Design a protein around this nucleic acid. Sequence first.
RNA 1: CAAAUGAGAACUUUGAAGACUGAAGUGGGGAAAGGUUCCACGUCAACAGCAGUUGGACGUGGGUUAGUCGAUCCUAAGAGAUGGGGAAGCUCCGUUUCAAAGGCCUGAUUUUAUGCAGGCCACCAUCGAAAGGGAAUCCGGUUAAGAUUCCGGAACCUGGAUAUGGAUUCUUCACGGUAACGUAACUGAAUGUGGAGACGUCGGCGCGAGCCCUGGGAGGAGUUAUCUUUUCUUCUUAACAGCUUAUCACCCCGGAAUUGGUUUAUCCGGAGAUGGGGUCUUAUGGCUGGAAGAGGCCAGCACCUUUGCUGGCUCCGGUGCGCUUGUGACGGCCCGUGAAAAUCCACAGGAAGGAAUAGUUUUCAUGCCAGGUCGUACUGAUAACCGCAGCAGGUCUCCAAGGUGAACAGCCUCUAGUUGAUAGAAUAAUGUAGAUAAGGGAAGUCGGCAAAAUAGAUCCGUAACUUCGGGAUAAGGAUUGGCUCUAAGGGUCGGGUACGAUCAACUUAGAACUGGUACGGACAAGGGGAAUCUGACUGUCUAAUUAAAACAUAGCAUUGCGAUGGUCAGAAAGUGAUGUUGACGCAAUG
RNA 2: GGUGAACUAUGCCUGAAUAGGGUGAAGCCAGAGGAAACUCUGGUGGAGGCUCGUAGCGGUUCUGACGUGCAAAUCGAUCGU
Lengths: 100, 91, 50, 150, 77, 63, 112
Amino acid sequence: QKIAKTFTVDVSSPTENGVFDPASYAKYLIDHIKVEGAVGNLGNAVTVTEDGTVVTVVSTAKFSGKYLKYLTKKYLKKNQLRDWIRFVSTKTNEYRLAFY
Amino acid sequence: AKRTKKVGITGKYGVRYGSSLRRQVKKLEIQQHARYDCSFCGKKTVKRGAAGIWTCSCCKKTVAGGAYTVSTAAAATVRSTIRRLREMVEA
Amino acid sequence: AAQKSFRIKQKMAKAKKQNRPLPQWIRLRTNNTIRYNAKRRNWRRTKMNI
Amino acid sequence: GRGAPLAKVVFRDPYKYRLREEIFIANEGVHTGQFIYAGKKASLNVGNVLPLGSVPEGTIVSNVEEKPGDRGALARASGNYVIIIGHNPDENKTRVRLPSGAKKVISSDARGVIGVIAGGGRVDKPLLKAGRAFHKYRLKRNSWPKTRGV
Amino acid sequence: AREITDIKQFLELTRRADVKTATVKINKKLNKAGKPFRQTKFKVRGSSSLYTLVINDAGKAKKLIQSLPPTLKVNRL
Amino acid sequence: AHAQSKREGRHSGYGKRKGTREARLPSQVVWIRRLRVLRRLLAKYRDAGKIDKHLYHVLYKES
Amino acid sequence: AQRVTFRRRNPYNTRSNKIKVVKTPGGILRAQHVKKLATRPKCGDCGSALQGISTLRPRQYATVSKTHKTVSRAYGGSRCANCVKERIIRAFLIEEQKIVKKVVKEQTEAAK
RNA sequence: CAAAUGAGAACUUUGAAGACUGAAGUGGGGAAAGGUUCCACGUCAACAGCAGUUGGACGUGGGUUAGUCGAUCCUAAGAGAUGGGGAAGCUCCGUUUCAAAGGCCUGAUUUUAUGCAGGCCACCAUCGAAAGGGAAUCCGGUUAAGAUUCCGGAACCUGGAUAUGGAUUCUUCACGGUAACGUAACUGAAUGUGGAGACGUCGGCGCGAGCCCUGGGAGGAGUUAUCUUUUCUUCUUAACAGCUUAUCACCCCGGAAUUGGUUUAUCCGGAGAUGGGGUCUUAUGGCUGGAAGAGGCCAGCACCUUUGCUGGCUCCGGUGCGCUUGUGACGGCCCGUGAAAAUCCACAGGAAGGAAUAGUUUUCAUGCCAGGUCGUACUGAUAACCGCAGCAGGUCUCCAAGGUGAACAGCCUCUAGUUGAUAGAAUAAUGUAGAUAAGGGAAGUCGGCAAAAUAGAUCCGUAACUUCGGGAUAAGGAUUGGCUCUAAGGGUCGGGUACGAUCAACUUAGAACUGGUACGGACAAGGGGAAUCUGACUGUCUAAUUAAAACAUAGCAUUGCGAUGGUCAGAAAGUGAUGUUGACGCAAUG
RNA sequence: GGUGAACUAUGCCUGAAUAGGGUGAAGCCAGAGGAAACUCUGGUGGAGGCUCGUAGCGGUUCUGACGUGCAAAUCGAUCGU
């Protein structure tokens, strides 16, 4: 059950329009993802990887796409990207951001 | 363990109907809900189904008997009398 | 009732077919004093009692 | 509606290959799996169907025929019986004591079951409740409750 | 519907002169994660019952479908 | 959130009871459990040999 | 929670109108009418449930094979083993005792 | 509130709000009844006690698809011919009675189908249930309206002729299991017998199903000034077929007092317990087929031929005095013991028949054909029924979410459904309905009428009297919130001859702290006591002025009657009720 | 001379419906006492034309509303079960 899982979020659409950048998004993700519901617990159990246009996280502890979508919507609401950006999923653990 | 002084099974009727009527009912109600001996099998398993229907739960035999007892005193007397008049043929 | 006999269903049929206004062409016919269907029936108003 | 139990008895047909069932009134002591012998040569045992003339004085009989062949008229209710007072072989007869106390003389060919009807002592328990009288008469007939004429 | 476990009972049923319909269905079924196999079902259709054979071996399916007579209406989907 | 507080023990004082002791939890049910707890322990000890059949019987009647 | 309806035109909870709630392949909750549960056949001698005989409704005994309705003994489908065994012991022993009574009556033919 | 539609909008539609029914619904179906009110399109003279563009209105049309759902078949209380008997007679009794009341196999089997010796009887009409008994169907889709009926798949039952697959010509009508019994089959007439059909009610316990709760994950939606990996929602699997799966029951084997096993409930065992081994009923569950291709949830392409195509996911669990329903094994009750028949099978039996490609098995498997007739829309009620009506009345029933709480109480909410009832203006007196009140406290009044008053739960405490059962929640008093803690109470294993991590649920009890001493904070929810009259009690009646002390009642007592009888009915009768009866009964009274 | 038991009264036949509490009968278990007879205590159990109280079924009081009514008998509260 303890196998590592790889969740990917394709930020290509917001980044091409240059309104939403993964540099701040990944930093928010690592700062606000919590395991055991406490502080000091991001001890390489979950790590977020940013390439500039496709941002992924890997987790050896527990983590879900529900959590990922929940945190992402928190960020989009925080910086007022909602009503323009949607956190969508292509396949399993293959989420992305959409402008439409 | 002793829940009532005297009413016994008639404690279900509570306070109603009179003590004399409850006393009379108590006598026959204990008789009619008692277990009796089965002469056929020797065990204590003879229940009353309805008045006059006595059923052994082991040997599955049904005995015709009294309304509230497996055998009334009158039937046992007739049993002896019919037996006594029968033996005149023997001697 | 939904579960009706054939005889009742046939009575429903005749009553439904009779329940029409007078044909407009028979009005113009000569010496005719029929201006309307005086044997009209509405389910709410008059029951057919069968 | 009957206080007395009934006995289902299976006799064989003497003339055809068939089992003939009969509905006897159960006498006290009769049990399932028991043989009962019916006829003039039947032994004086509880459950047997002897003619009245074949039984001694003082025999306790029940479901006794009023006439030979009527299949039983007297002493049929629970706990009731007939006693044989005596015989009158000339003009073949037998005088008996009925449950009401009445004396009656009838033909010695009338049959009866030896013993007393089962279910006796029924009226020794108070009904205690209008509801018990209600249930008693709903399987009998519509005779209850009774409004007084006054 | 009826189930068959034996191949030669399937073969006896394809030749009954009453079974003229066959339906082949391929499913993605997982028994163990490390070995995701491809399940197929041969759905023989008779008069009073529909017959389905189950094999969990992808390779044996190819040899089994080869042996069907060409006159039988075969539905592959 | 309130179910969690009740689990921690809050909101169950005398001012929050509206049914009787038996209505909230039948005393039969509590006895049903107790006897089944005792009986499954006695049969367990009998099968494991900790107590023999003779001690088992007297304790079974005791429980 | 989803609520269901009778599928027939009888709206009353009679014996022949019992329903069970089932979930369907379409995902919805529906009523399903279940009929009277079958009663097992009973031995004619003692009334005990017959072993080795299927319990169906009376009409379904017409279409089922003989093996299900019977067992492989004398009186197999009508009286259970212990009753037929009792009949076997009884039949032999009475006829044996009959030969005993036959010779006890037969001695008077030698005496006279 | 706005828009749209309309000369015309308080009332019609659409959106936005605000509310209510709050799952013994204002929801989703039916029974009776109605009869077309269903649905669509136009449409507003009249009707909808204001209005009207709307309608259960008006006009014109469309619509109800069955071997499996019902009727039909069966019998129930009971109706009712014939035979016969009454009756002037319309008719009455009578329902098996004083009646000459009956099929299927190679009989025959070529003027032949009854020209003519082939058996069993002991049948006695028929009608009477759309909730009783019954042969057999499910899922998905589909319509303006029908669907368990149409369509697509997948089954079953009944009837109907042969036919192939496994068995006889060297034992004719099977083998196996010590046995319970098993299997793919494995002849069986008359006659007889048995079972199923086929049954009350209540209580607790167990087990399922569905619903409720909940963890992970995979999706979608909500909230995000701040804040639980958050709130809501989808994640489903029919009939039928196969395998497997049970409490109970039964069989084989050591033969039991130190009596043992055992339920919540105490029953069982030398008539053989405990223990060890052992079959079947899709009881019920699981797996597979049905069947993922269905259906459901997401993402993407179609861009005015009344139409789809693509990609995924649809997976794992956990929990319980939960709710409801079913089942099971039990236990309680009765002076009450809780239909019938049709129908189906089984058994007993031993009539008949069977050897050159045959004879039987058509209760094994597979195969072929048919399943008519009548009903099927809709309402089922503050507008489809009945009450003169679109009447606050009346009218049978199934399903039943969350929270609070003992609770299908009250209150609030989800799904679903409604938002209907003439309206607009500051609302005088008098009202109707709901309330508050200084001090007094029944002085009011016929009368405490009306109202008020500690009402839940926990603890304490509880008198006279009593038929010993009660009285009793007697009386009377204290506590109750929030928070932070503490204690007690359970389930699941590897035994070299006392040991632990796991995991799990709400009931109790206690402590500290805290606050305008508040706390069953709304809701919900006994006033009590001392006595008299009266009826014992529970129950019943004057529908529409009397609910009572009246009537019933159990108990008590009295009366008649042993059948050619008592009581009662009928014009009569070869006529009836009691009576399927028999004095522990029936009938008549108090 | 006819017609009505669709209301209602009563019998019968066949169906259906009725939360949650209180009290705590018999039967049963375990202890305690006793020389015996038997008594006591704690449990268990779940009886009753018992009881508080929904649905239901009724209809007590306000002599409330209304009394050319919603209604030729209803409405509300209070009540019986």
